[PDB]
């Protein structure tokens, strides 16, 4: 859909009022299936590795997050539709400039293509950005065509701060999700019993990301 109206009349007010925004049927079935084939080809060819954490201590990463991921820039051969997805997410964000809270969004991560391979794998309750690393908006696209969450699980449960109800997000095919990445939205991926795929980008706030880079570059 035209980016300007979707951004200004739905995404912006949803985010500022609730800190979570779902856009169903984002790209349509044909593009959504082409993305799924590209993700399945990354899986089949051994590209995924264990998902990792910002800080590692004594624990195995797999006691925290059970997924396997790869990072995609969007220009790689065989990832062209993932690149269209990323460009589409970026177009919405550019149309939101200066209207998502007080953030100034200038950049983002590469895309994290992630798979929970069934077997009860999930992600314990966490905050995406608890300590000021620059991430202000988490953007996730789901591509699971026949997902029945009532049997296969895999629900993303968010616990938005200040609300009388939690937000249950089934990982529905062609669903796009935005949420604030900071401590306002602790969330968990409940155990998945079938192969579950999602693609995430995180958008950076310029000033916070600059402070986080300064911290990293000074040790």
């Amino acid at each position: 859909l035209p980016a300007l109206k979707l951004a200004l009349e739905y995404i912006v007010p949803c985010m500022n009022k609730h800190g979570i925004c779902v856009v169903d049927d984002f790209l349509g079935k044909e593009t959504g299936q082409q993305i799924g084939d590209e993700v399945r080809a990354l899986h089949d060819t051994g590209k995924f590795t264990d998902g990792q954490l910002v800080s590692q201590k004594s624990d195995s990463s797999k006691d925290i997050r059970g997924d396997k991921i790869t990072w995609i820039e969007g220009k790689e051969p065989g990832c062209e539709t993932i690149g269209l997805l990323m460009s589409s997410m970026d177009d919405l964000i550019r149309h939101c400039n200066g209207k998502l809270g007080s953030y100034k969004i200038n950049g983002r991560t590469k895309a994290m293509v992630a798979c929970y391979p069934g077997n009860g794998t999930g992600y314990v309750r966490h905050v995406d950005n608890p300590n000021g690393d620059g991430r202000c908006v988490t953007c996730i696209y789901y591509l699971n065509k026949d997902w029945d969450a009532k049997v296969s699980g895999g629900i993303l449960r968010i616990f938005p701060e200040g609300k009388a109800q939690f937000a249950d997000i089934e990982p529905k095919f062609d669903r796009l999700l935005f949420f604030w990445s900071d401590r306002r939205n602790p969330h968990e991926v409940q155990p998945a019993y079938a192969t579950r795929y999602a693609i995430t980008v995180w958008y950076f706030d310029a000033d916070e990301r600059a402070r986080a880079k300064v911290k990293y570059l000074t040790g």
Binding site: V54, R65, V127, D133, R135
Partner: peptide, 19 residues
């Protein structure tokens, strides 16, 4: 509990995309 021990990793230098 340090919540960074639960937070998903991102590269901290060299890999940001400019919009």
């Amino acid at each position: 509990l340090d919540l960074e021990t639960l937070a998903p990793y991102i590269p901290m230098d060299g890999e940001d995309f400019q919009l």
